[PDB]
Short mmCIF file of N, CA and C in Angstrom, two decimals:
data_model
loop_
_atom_site.label_atom_id
_atom_site.label_comp_id
_atom_site.label_asym_id
_atom_site.label_seq_id
_atom_site.Cartn_x
_atom_site.Cartn_y
_atom_site.Cartn_z
N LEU A 1 44.16 -29.72 8.85
CA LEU A 1 42.89 -29.97 9.51
C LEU A 1 42.50 -28.73 10.18
N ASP A 2 43.45 -28.06 10.82
CA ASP A 2 43.10 -26.83 11.47
C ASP A 2 42.75 -25.80 10.42
N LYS A 3 43.43 -25.76 9.30
CA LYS A 3 43.06 -24.76 8.31
C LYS A 3 41.63 -24.97 7.84
N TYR A 4 41.22 -26.22 7.63
CA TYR A 4 39.86 -26.51 7.19
C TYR A 4 38.85 -26.42 8.34
N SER A 5 39.28 -26.82 9.53
CA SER A 5 38.45 -26.80 10.73
C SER A 5 38.15 -25.37 11.08
N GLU A 6 39.16 -24.51 10.94
CA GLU A 6 39.03 -23.11 11.20
C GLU A 6 38.24 -22.49 10.08
N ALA A 7 38.59 -22.80 8.84
CA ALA A 7 37.83 -22.25 7.75
C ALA A 7 36.40 -22.73 7.88
N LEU A 8 36.20 -23.95 8.37
CA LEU A 8 34.90 -24.51 8.59
C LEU A 8 34.19 -23.85 9.72
N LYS A 9 34.82 -23.65 10.88
CA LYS A 9 34.09 -23.04 11.96
C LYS A 9 33.74 -21.64 11.54
N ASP A 10 34.57 -21.03 10.70
CA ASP A 10 34.33 -19.69 10.24
C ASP A 10 33.25 -19.74 9.20
N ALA A 11 33.25 -20.73 8.31
CA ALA A 11 32.18 -20.82 7.33
C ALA A 11 30.88 -21.07 8.05
N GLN A 12 30.92 -21.86 9.12
CA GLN A 12 29.78 -22.21 9.94
C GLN A 12 29.32 -21.04 10.77
N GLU A 13 30.24 -20.23 11.27
CA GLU A 13 29.87 -19.06 12.03
C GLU A 13 29.30 -18.03 11.08
N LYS A 14 29.92 -17.91 9.91
CA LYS A 14 29.46 -17.01 8.88
C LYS A 14 28.12 -17.49 8.41
N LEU A 15 27.94 -18.81 8.34
CA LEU A 15 26.70 -19.44 7.97
C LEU A 15 25.64 -19.19 8.99
N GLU A 16 25.96 -19.33 10.27
CA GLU A 16 24.97 -19.08 11.28
C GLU A 16 24.65 -17.61 11.25
N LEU A 17 25.66 -16.78 11.07
CA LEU A 17 25.44 -15.37 11.02
C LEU A 17 24.65 -14.98 9.81
N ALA A 18 24.97 -15.52 8.63
CA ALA A 18 24.28 -15.25 7.38
C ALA A 18 22.89 -15.81 7.45
N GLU A 19 22.74 -16.92 8.16
CA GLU A 19 21.45 -17.50 8.34
C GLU A 19 20.69 -16.54 9.21
N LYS A 20 21.34 -15.94 10.20
CA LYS A 20 20.70 -14.94 11.01
C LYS A 20 20.55 -13.64 10.25
N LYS A 21 21.44 -13.32 9.32
CA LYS A 21 21.22 -12.11 8.57
C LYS A 21 19.93 -12.32 7.83
N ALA A 22 19.77 -13.53 7.29
CA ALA A 22 18.59 -13.94 6.57
C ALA A 22 17.40 -14.13 7.48
N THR A 23 17.60 -14.63 8.70
CA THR A 23 16.53 -14.88 9.65
C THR A 23 16.02 -13.57 10.16
N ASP A 24 16.93 -12.62 10.39
CA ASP A 24 16.56 -11.31 10.86
C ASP A 24 15.99 -10.57 9.69
N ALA A 25 16.60 -10.69 8.50
CA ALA A 25 16.05 -10.09 7.31
C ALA A 25 14.73 -10.75 7.05
N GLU A 26 14.62 -12.04 7.36
CA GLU A 26 13.37 -12.72 7.17
C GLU A 26 12.40 -12.24 8.21
N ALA A 27 12.83 -12.04 9.44
CA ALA A 27 11.93 -11.55 10.46
C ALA A 27 11.43 -10.18 10.08
N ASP A 28 12.29 -9.39 9.46
CA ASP A 28 11.98 -8.05 9.04
C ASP A 28 11.11 -8.08 7.82
N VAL A 29 11.36 -8.99 6.88
CA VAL A 29 10.50 -8.99 5.73
C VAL A 29 9.20 -9.59 6.16
N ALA A 30 9.23 -10.55 7.09
CA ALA A 30 8.04 -11.17 7.60
C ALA A 30 7.23 -10.14 8.33
N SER A 31 7.90 -9.24 9.07
CA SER A 31 7.21 -8.17 9.76
C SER A 31 6.59 -7.30 8.72
N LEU A 32 7.37 -7.00 7.69
CA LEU A 32 6.91 -6.22 6.59
C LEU A 32 5.84 -6.95 5.83
N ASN A 33 5.94 -8.25 5.66
CA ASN A 33 4.90 -8.96 4.95
C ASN A 33 3.64 -8.87 5.76
N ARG A 34 3.75 -8.94 7.07
CA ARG A 34 2.56 -8.79 7.87
C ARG A 34 2.04 -7.38 7.70
N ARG A 35 2.93 -6.40 7.66
CA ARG A 35 2.52 -5.03 7.43
C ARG A 35 1.96 -4.84 6.04
N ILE A 36 2.45 -5.54 5.02
CA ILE A 36 1.88 -5.25 3.72
C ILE A 36 0.55 -5.90 3.71
N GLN A 37 0.42 -7.06 4.31
CA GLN A 37 -0.85 -7.72 4.30
C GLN A 37 -1.88 -6.92 5.07
N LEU A 38 -1.49 -6.34 6.19
CA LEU A 38 -2.41 -5.57 7.00
C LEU A 38 -2.68 -4.19 6.44
N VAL A 39 -1.65 -3.56 5.90
CA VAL A 39 -1.78 -2.24 5.37
C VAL A 39 -2.44 -2.29 4.04
N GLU A 40 -2.01 -3.21 3.18
CA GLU A 40 -2.62 -3.38 1.89
C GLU A 40 -4.04 -3.84 2.13
N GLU A 41 -4.28 -4.67 3.15
CA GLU A 41 -5.66 -5.03 3.38
C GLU A 41 -6.40 -3.76 3.72
N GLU A 42 -5.83 -2.88 4.54
CA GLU A 42 -6.48 -1.62 4.80
C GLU A 42 -6.52 -0.74 3.57
N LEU A 43 -5.54 -0.82 2.70
CA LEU A 43 -5.53 -0.05 1.46
C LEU A 43 -6.76 -0.41 0.72
N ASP A 44 -7.01 -1.71 0.62
CA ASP A 44 -8.15 -2.24 -0.07
C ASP A 44 -9.41 -2.00 0.69
N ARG A 45 -9.36 -2.03 2.01
CA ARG A 45 -10.55 -1.76 2.78
C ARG A 45 -10.82 -0.28 2.71
N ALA A 46 -9.78 0.53 2.71
CA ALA A 46 -9.94 1.97 2.62
C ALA A 46 -10.41 2.29 1.24
N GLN A 47 -9.90 1.54 0.25
CA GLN A 47 -10.28 1.72 -1.13
C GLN A 47 -11.69 1.25 -1.32
N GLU A 48 -12.09 0.21 -0.61
CA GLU A 48 -13.44 -0.31 -0.67
C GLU A 48 -14.37 0.61 0.08
N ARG A 49 -13.90 1.15 1.20
CA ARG A 49 -14.69 2.08 1.98
C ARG A 49 -14.85 3.31 1.09
N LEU A 50 -13.76 3.64 0.40
CA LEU A 50 -13.76 4.74 -0.52
C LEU A 50 -14.69 4.46 -1.64
N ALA A 51 -14.61 3.28 -2.23
CA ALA A 51 -15.51 2.98 -3.30
C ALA A 51 -16.91 3.09 -2.79
N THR A 52 -17.13 2.65 -1.56
CA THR A 52 -18.42 2.71 -0.95
C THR A 52 -18.83 4.15 -0.76
N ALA A 53 -17.93 4.99 -0.25
CA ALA A 53 -18.22 6.40 -0.03
C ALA A 53 -18.49 7.09 -1.34
N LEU A 54 -17.78 6.70 -2.40
CA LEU A 54 -17.92 7.27 -3.72
C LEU A 54 -19.19 6.80 -4.38
N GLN A 55 -19.56 5.55 -4.18
CA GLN A 55 -20.79 5.02 -4.72
C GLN A 55 -21.93 5.67 -4.00
N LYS A 56 -21.76 5.84 -2.68
CA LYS A 56 -22.74 6.52 -1.88
C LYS A 56 -22.78 7.94 -2.29
N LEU A 57 -21.63 8.52 -2.64
CA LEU A 57 -21.57 9.88 -3.11
C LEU A 57 -22.31 10.00 -4.40
N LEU B 1 40.73 -34.30 7.13
CA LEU B 1 40.97 -33.10 6.33
C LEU B 1 39.80 -32.95 5.37
N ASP B 2 39.35 -34.08 4.83
CA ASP B 2 38.23 -34.11 3.94
C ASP B 2 36.97 -33.94 4.74
N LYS B 3 36.87 -34.50 5.93
CA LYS B 3 35.63 -34.27 6.65
C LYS B 3 35.43 -32.78 6.85
N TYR B 4 36.51 -32.05 7.17
CA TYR B 4 36.42 -30.62 7.37
C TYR B 4 36.33 -29.85 6.07
N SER B 5 37.02 -30.32 5.03
CA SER B 5 37.06 -29.69 3.72
C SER B 5 35.71 -29.81 3.08
N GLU B 6 35.08 -30.96 3.26
CA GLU B 6 33.77 -31.24 2.75
C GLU B 6 32.79 -30.48 3.59
N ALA B 7 32.95 -30.54 4.91
CA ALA B 7 32.07 -29.80 5.75
C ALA B 7 32.20 -28.34 5.40
N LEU B 8 33.41 -27.90 5.05
CA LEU B 8 33.70 -26.55 4.63
C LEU B 8 33.15 -26.23 3.30
N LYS B 9 33.31 -27.07 2.29
CA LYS B 9 32.77 -26.64 1.03
C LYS B 9 31.28 -26.51 1.20
N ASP B 10 30.70 -27.34 2.07
CA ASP B 10 29.29 -27.30 2.29
C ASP B 10 28.95 -26.13 3.18
N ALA B 11 29.72 -25.86 4.22
CA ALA B 11 29.40 -24.74 5.10
C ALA B 11 29.58 -23.46 4.34
N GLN B 12 30.60 -23.43 3.48
CA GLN B 12 30.93 -22.29 2.69
C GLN B 12 29.91 -22.10 1.61
N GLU B 13 29.43 -23.17 0.99
CA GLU B 13 28.41 -23.01 -0.03
C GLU B 13 27.13 -22.63 0.65
N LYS B 14 26.85 -23.25 1.80
CA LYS B 14 25.67 -22.92 2.55
C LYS B 14 25.78 -21.47 2.94
N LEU B 15 26.98 -21.00 3.26
CA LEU B 15 27.19 -19.60 3.57
C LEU B 15 26.91 -18.81 2.33
N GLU B 16 27.41 -19.18 1.17
CA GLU B 16 27.15 -18.33 0.03
C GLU B 16 25.65 -18.29 -0.21
N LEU B 17 24.98 -19.39 0.04
CA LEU B 17 23.55 -19.50 -0.12
C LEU B 17 22.79 -18.84 1.01
N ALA B 18 23.35 -18.79 2.22
CA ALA B 18 22.71 -18.15 3.36
C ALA B 18 22.90 -16.67 3.23
N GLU B 19 24.03 -16.30 2.65
CA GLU B 19 24.37 -14.93 2.39
C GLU B 19 23.50 -14.52 1.25
N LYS B 20 23.29 -15.42 0.27
CA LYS B 20 22.40 -15.13 -0.82
C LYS B 20 21.01 -15.04 -0.27
N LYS B 21 20.63 -15.96 0.61
CA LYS B 21 19.31 -15.90 1.18
C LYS B 21 19.18 -14.63 1.95
N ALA B 22 20.23 -14.21 2.66
CA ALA B 22 20.21 -12.96 3.39
C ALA B 22 20.11 -11.81 2.44
N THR B 23 20.78 -11.92 1.30
CA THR B 23 20.77 -10.89 0.29
C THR B 23 19.39 -10.77 -0.27
N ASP B 24 18.75 -11.90 -0.53
CA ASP B 24 17.43 -11.95 -1.08
C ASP B 24 16.42 -11.61 -0.02
N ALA B 25 16.64 -12.06 1.22
CA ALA B 25 15.72 -11.78 2.29
C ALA B 25 15.77 -10.31 2.55
N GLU B 26 16.97 -9.73 2.50
CA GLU B 26 17.19 -8.31 2.70
C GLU B 26 16.70 -7.56 1.49
N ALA B 27 16.88 -8.12 0.29
CA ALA B 27 16.37 -7.49 -0.91
C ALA B 27 14.88 -7.44 -0.81
N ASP B 28 14.30 -8.49 -0.21
CA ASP B 28 12.90 -8.56 0.01
C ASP B 28 12.56 -7.66 1.18
N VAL B 29 13.43 -7.51 2.18
CA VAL B 29 13.08 -6.58 3.24
C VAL B 29 12.97 -5.22 2.62
N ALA B 30 13.94 -4.85 1.81
CA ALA B 30 13.97 -3.56 1.15
C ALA B 30 12.89 -3.39 0.11
N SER B 31 12.59 -4.44 -0.66
CA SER B 31 11.58 -4.38 -1.71
C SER B 31 10.22 -4.35 -1.08
N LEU B 32 10.08 -5.06 0.03
CA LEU B 32 8.83 -5.03 0.71
C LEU B 32 8.77 -3.75 1.47
N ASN B 33 9.86 -3.26 2.05
CA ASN B 33 9.75 -2.03 2.80
C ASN B 33 9.27 -0.99 1.84
N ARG B 34 9.81 -1.01 0.63
CA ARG B 34 9.32 -0.14 -0.39
C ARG B 34 7.84 -0.38 -0.61
N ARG B 35 7.43 -1.64 -0.82
CA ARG B 35 6.03 -1.95 -1.05
C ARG B 35 5.13 -1.67 0.14
N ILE B 36 5.61 -1.88 1.37
CA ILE B 36 4.81 -1.66 2.55
C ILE B 36 4.60 -0.20 2.61
N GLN B 37 5.66 0.57 2.38
CA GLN B 37 5.55 1.99 2.39
C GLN B 37 4.65 2.43 1.28
N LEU B 38 4.71 1.78 0.12
CA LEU B 38 3.83 2.16 -0.96
C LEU B 38 2.40 1.87 -0.60
N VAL B 39 2.12 0.75 0.08
CA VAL B 39 0.76 0.50 0.46
C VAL B 39 0.37 1.42 1.61
N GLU B 40 1.30 1.79 2.49
CA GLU B 40 0.99 2.74 3.55
C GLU B 40 0.70 4.10 2.97
N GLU B 41 1.45 4.51 1.95
CA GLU B 41 1.22 5.78 1.31
C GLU B 41 -0.06 5.74 0.53
N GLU B 42 -0.31 4.63 -0.16
CA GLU B 42 -1.51 4.49 -0.93
C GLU B 42 -2.67 4.37 0.03
N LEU B 43 -2.46 3.73 1.19
CA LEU B 43 -3.48 3.66 2.21
C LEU B 43 -3.77 5.03 2.73
N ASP B 44 -2.74 5.83 3.03
CA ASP B 44 -3.03 7.15 3.50
C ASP B 44 -3.80 7.87 2.43
N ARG B 45 -3.44 7.66 1.16
CA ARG B 45 -4.17 8.29 0.08
C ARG B 45 -5.59 7.77 -0.01
N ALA B 46 -5.82 6.47 0.18
CA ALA B 46 -7.16 5.91 0.15
C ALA B 46 -7.97 6.48 1.29
N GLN B 47 -7.33 6.67 2.46
CA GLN B 47 -7.95 7.24 3.65
C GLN B 47 -8.24 8.72 3.47
N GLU B 48 -7.35 9.44 2.78
CA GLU B 48 -7.54 10.85 2.49
C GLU B 48 -8.63 11.01 1.45
N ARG B 49 -8.63 10.12 0.46
CA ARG B 49 -9.63 10.10 -0.57
C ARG B 49 -10.93 9.70 0.06
N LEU B 50 -10.89 8.80 1.05
CA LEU B 50 -12.06 8.38 1.79
C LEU B 50 -12.56 9.52 2.62
N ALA B 51 -11.69 10.22 3.33
CA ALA B 51 -12.16 11.35 4.11
C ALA B 51 -12.79 12.36 3.18
N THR B 52 -12.21 12.52 1.99
CA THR B 52 -12.70 13.43 0.98
C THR B 52 -14.04 12.96 0.44
N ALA B 53 -14.16 11.67 0.11
CA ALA B 53 -15.38 11.09 -0.41
C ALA B 53 -16.46 11.17 0.62
N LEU B 54 -16.10 10.99 1.89
CA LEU B 54 -17.03 11.05 2.99
C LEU B 54 -17.43 12.48 3.23
N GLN B 55 -16.50 13.43 3.09
CA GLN B 55 -16.90 14.81 3.25
C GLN B 55 -17.78 15.21 2.09
N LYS B 56 -17.46 14.74 0.88
CA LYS B 56 -18.26 15.02 -0.28
C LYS B 56 -19.58 14.33 -0.15
N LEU B 57 -19.58 13.13 0.44
CA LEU B 57 -20.79 12.39 0.68
C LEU B 57 -21.63 13.16 1.63
#
């Protein structure tokens, strides 16, 4: 029981940690997703501003 | 023993899956970091092209 309980608390700690590796990686990708959405939106707005500047050109 | 063994196979599988999720979340952090950087670089390029188009304008 202790071998499984220990393996379990460790699987659970590893799980909480891995969940946090994922949660933090998720927070980071989410931060990045917000950045890609904002930057890519600016890429497109800059590209649109550019298209506008070029069309105006 | 089974409550813990079962909780363990599940905590352990959840760990492999949380670790996988972390792997994928991190793969996505890295793939997005690459993409965010690509949109930031392309944005800087759109902005440089915009400054250029605007100067040409």
